[PDB]
Structure formats: structure tokens, C-alpha cells
Structure 1
Amino acid sequence: AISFDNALGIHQHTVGVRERNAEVISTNIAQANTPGYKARGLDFAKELQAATSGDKLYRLPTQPDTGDGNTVDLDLERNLFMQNQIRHQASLDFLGSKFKNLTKAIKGE
């Protein structure tokens, strides 16, 4: 034992995935008005598995498009972006406390 992997856990890979998800969600919000653009989804479980050791998912629209072809539901995108930011803040707190505890033990302070 006594290794950074065994000490940090999955809180280092989770942060990267949460930032990846925010990039995907922000892309859907920006491309909301572009006709023909299809909303992009991200699988957290698969992304976390790939990050730990190392495809395109589309979001099914709740209602038909008005003709443009864009399936971005901006009501859902804001809700997911808000959730992603909260869980990302927790992951930083979880990962940040891993380093603080490691520093505390190696210095006894």
C-alpha cells in the first residue's frame, strides 16, 4: 500500500469525467438553436470505467422538433448542468481532502 492510487481512490478520475460532462452539456446549450444538431449525452459509468483503465450516445427528445431538427431540450440541459456542477464540487472536496489527510499524516500536524 502507501500509494497515491490507493489513497486518492476514484475521486481523481471522477473530477475529469465531471468536467467532461460539463463540456458536453455546455455544447448542447450553445448548439440549441442550430438546426439539425442532435443533443449529445454522456454515460458516467462507462466514462469512469474508461478513465480508471485507459460510443456516441444521443438523448431521445421528449417532444418532436418544430422542423429545424434540433433535439436539444434546453429545460433539461440547465437542470443537468446544475446537477453536474454540484457533484463536481463534491468531488473536488472529496479529492482535496485526500491530499490534506495525506499531508496531515506525513507531517503529524
Structure 2
Amino acid sequence: DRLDAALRFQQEALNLRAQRQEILAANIANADTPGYQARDIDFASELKKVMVGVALTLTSSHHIPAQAVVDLLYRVPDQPSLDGNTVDMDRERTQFADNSLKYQMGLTVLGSQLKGMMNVLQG
């Protein structure tokens, strides 16, 4: 559908921001686990990958339709801890706040596009 193509980029950006938000909050929650590595995703490359499948064929009514079913990069440690935990509070707190801001911005842009498509139709 053409409607999907217009809203594909913002939807994928919003979903990627939510996933990275979950990853950052997991990094915050597991700050005290000894031996836990701080993981993160490269937002731009994954957004390229998602932006850049074959529903199985249903011959009749009984035939069952096809059933549907990111890469994590390690953060470079800054300070060496003794328990092997590489999670840094300041870095991930700033990243968490930034991801929240960008999620809000994506919501704003997507809502503006939908509202414009709506006022085009209203009449």
C-alpha cells in the first residue's frame, strides 16, 4: 500500500527507538550484575537495514496462512571495575534521556503526518 510507504520510515524509527530504549533500560537495571557487558545497537545502521516476506499461498479456505516469527554491539568500557561490570551510569543516563527525547520527536512527526493526511480528507 502507498500509505505504508509514506509512514514506513517514521514507524521503523519509532520501533527502533523503543527497542533501543528497552536495551538501555536493561543496561541500567543490570548495572550491579558482576560480569554483565553493556550492550547497545547502532541506530542508523539498523534503520538502514529495516528500511531496505513471502506469505505462503492459500489454495482454499481450510489451508492455513503463513505464520510469522537486530544485532547488539558491546559498549566500549571507560573505567575498569573489579567485578567485570562495564555499565557506566553517566553515559547510559544521557543516552536514555536522548532516546526518550527522540521517541517523543518521532511521535510528534508521525502524528503531524497522520493529522495532515486527515485534514486533507475532512470535508
In the alignment, what sits opposite 1:13?
Answer: 12
Q: TM-score, normalised by structure 2?
A: 0.79
Q: TM-score, normalised by structure 1?
A: 0.88
The alpha-carbon deviation at position 3 of structure 1 amounts to 2.0
Structure 2 gaps of 5+ residues are 54-70
In the alignment, what sits opposite 1:93?
Answer: 108
Aligned residues: 106
Superposed CA RMSD: 1.7
Query: Aligned AA for 2:45?
Result: K
Structure 1 gaps of 5+ residues are none
Structure whose CA Rg is larger = 2
Query: Aligned AA for 2:90?
Result: D
Following TM superposition, the consecutive aligned residue runs of length 4 or more in structure 1 with deviations greater than 6 angstroms are none
In the alignment, what sits opposite 2:83?
Answer: 68
> 8 Å contact 2:12–2:50 — kept in the other structure?
yes
Q: Quick one: percent identity of the two aligned structures?
A: 44
Q: Secondary structure at the match of 1:64?
A: coil
Separation in structure 2 between the aligned mates of residue 98 and residue 23 of structure 1, nearest angstrom? 26
Moved more, 71-80 or 42-51: 42-51
